[PDB]
Design a protein around this ligand. Structure first.
Ligand SMILES: [Zn+2]
Lengths: 140, 73, 301, 115, 73, 193
């Protein structure tokens, strides 16, 4: 513990943190009370609900730890891993972080010389932008 | 001072307002000659409000029976 | 671009031309014209370039008329989204799901039916909206047919309360549903919703519910330390026994490794026969059963 | 005789339940809840200069899952207390601030740090 | 109670053809005794009935029927 | 504009336009011209240039690229930190992050569905707007207009909402924690001590 470096988390970094990808709003089967597949709480991505236990029941014992059963893809380990492992959601269309905008101008920074009304209108789908013009082409 | 009568009256009034909206919506989506007062009114809002009146209310307080004077106070 | 985005959505609908009978039937006519145009274009046989461009243009005009129809029916779909608002799904989300149903309906609508598009569409709109409500409203997902079971039992029970003016008994409800009481209780328990931890406890404003319910995954220090002391005492007790006897009982009960080995399973590394190892297993169990090596382990249970 | 009887107020805790989202002990008397060592208490302790006591009151005696069983075992066995680890609430914070797209990376002077 | 009932005028659709009059309200004795309610965890309440009259100009008929809106604490 | 003339002006809408602009941004030239403006400038324009220089220089010196403004992938809190803990009585106990993640997942999936099939511009634009609104809520519920009330009784909690205020993680679970081996009781005077 010498320095807690903090900065902007790029998309590649977020992908690096993720151990999978969430693809459903599923949380838990209403009957089995167990996590579903590839949704929130999924054991394949975050971790096993029970210590060293998988979902299918193959390889439940503590003996043969540190393996991934091909059936449900759960890596047998301590349940505490769920408190650490994190996933990520892919968005079809990009969005903009609420924090850096919609605030004081020391965080938005006027990085683009556009008034807050302009941004509020444009990133929320109320007005267009001319991203790029071939002005030399138009002039020739 | 909104004595308890006026409080419960306001709550049942809100409930009957929801009942009025529900019966009007039902009227807009119901055919004539199959309509009776028994069927059209949904009693859910009034009961749900007079029951949620006691809950989540800063005015419906758990009575304190430490002694008769705590009760009166 | 304003708070309450549904207002901006309604303005985004704006003013668009509502379609009277001849208008939408002609629109559908050139819709199917563009349909056959793109069908002909899709075929592999060679067509003249100008004819292909004409077919593409007709298909494009059909597309434009399609979006005209969708913007016209935006008002109907938002009305039908009103009709199912206030059931755990945000109003604009219901509007969007109904719009998905609308694009389905237009994809399955034509003038061959002697009826207005409004009558035909509403079925698909309600279908998409109710499917979305069933599959995305509740925190704990409920299958669609459980969803219809629970809503059926709920509405009929409401009718029972309305008629009899009193809470119906479970058996009467069970016979009315035609199922048995156990299914009634099952669906009744399955038809709940979670309560949020981040709610004021109400005992005090600062306190919240998520800070009053204890966990089970915590390792109780007393239990962990008692287990460690049991491990040490038991291992010492086996060390009291002979080396071979202690070893064989350990493998038979897996003190060294989480998987105990069967008697024959012990008779491979040690080089003893399954009945021989069995006989010493019986011998170990006896020896640890004498009162000498029993006082210590009785209390640990 | 008022209703502030001692039997109601009297509470104590060696070790008992704990919270879930953050592993620190839970509050209240009905659940064997430890008293709160709030901000002003650590202000007073820092004023005294007693840093080791603050470290144990903040890591060993709560908010460290690896440390609690260790300290219980050390006391009952008589062995000296072990070195405190990193608390768990800070890990919760690190993950949470990593969920806002801030790459809060703990670093050492010589490259990556060991945790 | 009768005031809040009378406040809700009979509902009129866009055609204004039909109307629901809540003329009279009434009570019945509660089913559970006060001591019973306290012991068995029942909200002390009694029924509250009201006579709803459906009247439609198109039908030119009046149909009266009593309805029950739920237990009243 | 598009119909009368294309292939000359490239136009876009929404956060994707911001991503493109930041990708094509040349902040060094902005810093240079703003330095020139400060060298010869007057009025509040000078103050605006001062703030702009502050931020652009802060970004230029740092290695991390500005495109981090627009997040493409949303990280998810580990499940134990948002527990759907079983509760006695057949009931449940859930944290609001579950709700917000459910909403953003729903809206992303539905946007994907719309993009897969041929869909107009109006519906896809509105859907992207709802996606942006949902993500806004997850990171900061209540920073624009009404908050995402969820059940309706109260605004839903948010990622940053846990990280702020009297009840925030910082001032309640890192500076002042509860402690084991402690007790409390009424106090009386005993002089003989
Ligand atoms: Zn498995």
């Amino acid at each position: 513990f010498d320095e807690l470096r903090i900065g902007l988390a790029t998309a590649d970094d977020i992908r690096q943190w993720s151990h999978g990808e969430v693809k459903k709003p599923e949380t838990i089967n209403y009957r089995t009370l167990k996590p579903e597949k590839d949704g929130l709480f999924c054991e394949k991505i975050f971790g096993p609900t029970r210590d060293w236990e998988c979902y299918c029941g193959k390889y439940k014992r503590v003996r043969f730890k540190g393996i991934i059963c091909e059936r449900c893809g759960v890596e047998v380990t301590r349940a505490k891993v769920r408190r650490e492992r994190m996933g990520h959601i892919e968005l079809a269309a990009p969005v903009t972080h609420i924090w850096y905008f919609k605030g004081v101008p020391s965080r938005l920074g006027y990085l683009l010389d556009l008034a807050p009304k302009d941004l509020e209108k444009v990133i929320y789908f109320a007005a267009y932008m001319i991203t790029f013009v071939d002005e030399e082409r138009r002039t020739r | 001072i909104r004595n308890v009568g006026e409080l419960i009256q306001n709550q049942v009034r809100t409930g009957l307002a929801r009942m009025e909206r529900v019966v009007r919506e039902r009227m807009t989506t119901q055919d004539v000659e199959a309509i009776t007062p028994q069927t059209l009114i949904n009693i859910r809002p009034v009961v749900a409000s007079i029951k949620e009146f006691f809950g989540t209310s800063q005015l419906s307080q758990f009575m304190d029976q430490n002694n008769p004077l705590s009760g009166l106070t | 671009a304003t708070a309450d985005p549904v207002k901006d959505y309604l303005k985004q609908i704006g003013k668009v031309p509502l379609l009277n009978a001849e208008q939408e039937v002609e629109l559908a006519k050139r819709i199917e014209a563009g349909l056959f145009a793109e069908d002909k274009l899709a075929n592999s046989d060679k067509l003249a370039p100008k004819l292909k461009r004409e077919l593409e243009i007709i298909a494009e005009d059909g597309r434009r008329a399609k979006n005209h129809l969708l913007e016209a029916n935006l008002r109907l779909v938002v009305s039908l989204a009103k009709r199912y608002t206030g059931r755990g799904m945000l109003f604009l989300d219901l509007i969007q799901e109904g719009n998905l149903g609308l694009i389905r309906a237009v994809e399955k609508f034509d003038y061959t039916k002697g009826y207005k598009f409004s009558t035909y569409a509403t079925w698909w709109i309600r279908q998409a909206i109710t499917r979305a409500m069933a599959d995305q409203a509740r925190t704990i997902r409920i299958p669609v047919h459980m969803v219809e079971v629970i809503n059926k039992l709920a509405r009929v029970q409401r009718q029972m309360l309305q008629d009899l003016g009193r809470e119906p008994t479970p058996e009467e409800l069970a016979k009315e549903l035609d199922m048995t009481p156990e299914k009634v209780i099952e669906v009744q328990k399955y038809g709940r919703e979670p309560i949020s931890l981040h709610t004021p406890l109400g005992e005090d404003g600062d306190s919240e519910f998520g800070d009053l319910i204890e966990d089970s995954e915590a390792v109780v220090p007393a239990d962990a330390v008692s287990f460690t002391l049991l491990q040490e005492q038991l291992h010492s007790v086996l060390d009291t026994l002979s080396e071979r006897e202690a070893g064989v009982v350990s493998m038979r009960f897996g003190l060294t490794d989480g998987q105990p080995k069967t008697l024959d399973e012990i008779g491979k590394v040690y080089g003893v026969t399954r009945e021989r190892i069995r006989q010493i297993e019986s011998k170990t169990m006896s020896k640890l059963r004498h009162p000498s090596r029993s006082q210590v382990l009785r209390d640990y249970l | 005789k008022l209703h502030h009887l001692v039997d109601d107020k009297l509470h104590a805790r060696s070790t008992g339940p704990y919270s879930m989202i953050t592993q620190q002990p839970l509050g209240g008397k009905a659940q064997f809840g430890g008293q709160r060592f709030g901000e002003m208490e650590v202000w007073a302790l820092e004023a005294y200069g007693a840093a080791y006591a603050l470290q144990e009151l903040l890591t060993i005696k709560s908010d460290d899952v690896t440390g609690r069983v260790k300290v219980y075992e050390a006391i009952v066995k008589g062995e000296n207390i072990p070195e405190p680890g990193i608390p768990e609430s800070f890990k919760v914070l690190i993950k949470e601030m990593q969920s806002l797209c801030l790459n809060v990376e703990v670093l050492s002077s010589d490259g990556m740090s060991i945790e | 109670l009768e005031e809040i009932f009378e406040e809700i005028s009979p509902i009129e659709d866009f055609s204004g053809s039909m109307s629901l009059t809540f003329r009279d309200h009434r009570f019945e004795p509660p089913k559970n005794s006060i001591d019973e309610c306290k012991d068995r965890d029942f909200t002390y309440a009694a029924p509250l009935f009201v006579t709803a009259e459906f009247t439609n100009n198109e039908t030119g008929e009046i149909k009266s029927q009593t309805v029950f809106m739920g237990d009243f604490p | 504009l598009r119909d009368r003339f294309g292939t000359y002006f490239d136009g876009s809408m929404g956060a994707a336009a911001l991503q493109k602009r930041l990708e094509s941004f040349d902040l060094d030239e902005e810093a240079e011209r703003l330095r020139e403006i400060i060298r010869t400038g007057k009025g509040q324009k000078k103050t605006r240039a001062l703030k702009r220089l502050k931020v652009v220089s802060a970004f230029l010196q740092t290695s991390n690229s500005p495109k981090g403004m627009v997040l493409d992938c949303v990280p998810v809190i580990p499940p134990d930190l948002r527990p759907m803990v079983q509760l006695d009585g057949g009931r449940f106990a859930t944290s609001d992050l579950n709700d917000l993640y459910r909403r953003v997942i729903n809206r992303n999936n539905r946007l994907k569905r719309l993009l897969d099939l041929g869909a107009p511009e109006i519906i896809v634009n509105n859907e992207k707007r709802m996606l942006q609104e949902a993500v806004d809520a997850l990171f900061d519920n209540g920073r624009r207009g009404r908050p995402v009330t969820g059940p309706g009784n109260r605004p839903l909690k948010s990622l940053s909402d846990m990280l702020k205020g009297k009840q925030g993680r910082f001032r309640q679970n890192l500076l002042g924690k509860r402690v084991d081996y402690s007790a409390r009781s009424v106090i009386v005077v005993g002089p003989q001590l």
